[PDB]
Amino acid sequence: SCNNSCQSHSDCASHCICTFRGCGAVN
3-state secondary structure 1-27: CCCECCCCCCCCCCCEEEECCEEEECC
Experimental method: NMR
End-to-end CA distance of the chain: 11
Handedness of CA 19, 12, 22, 9 (dihedral sign): negative
Burial readout 2-27 (b: 16 or more C-beta within 10 A, e: otherwise): beeebeeeeebeeebebeeebbbeee
**Which amino acid is located at 16 in the chain?**
C
